[PDB]
Amino acid sequence: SMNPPPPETSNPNKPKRQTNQLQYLLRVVLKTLWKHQFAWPFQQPVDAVKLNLPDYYKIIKTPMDMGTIKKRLENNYYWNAQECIQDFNTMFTNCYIYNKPGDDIVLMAEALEKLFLQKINELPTE
DSSP states (O other): OOOOOOOOSOOTTSOOOOOHHHHHIIIIIIHHHHHSTTOGGGSSOOOTTTTTOTTHHHHOSSOOOHHHHHHHHHTTOOSSHHHHHHHHHHHHHHHHHHSOTTOHHHHHHHHHHHHHHHHHHTOOOO
């Protein structure tokens, strides 16, 4: 019923770096997806209380959202591009698992995922 704590965006024990690929993921990939007309459901964690989704955090055991990814990029949480790409892929997959094919939210996630794949196809070499 109650929401879990959000995914961590700060952890002094976790190793991290600034890389050209992580800068690309913030300034090109996230920038593009964040501004999209369909971004808004993905800009913060799923509020399963407000949305009356009492099963959401029973079905989705690795929550992720672009608000969390934005904070992780801006606050240098990540070691490499793969960690950040995995977060985006977890966000999309969660949406596809919880919802039905052709649901509005699934079509919105698919539109963001198409733009995501366009942009990571052109990920710079390290």
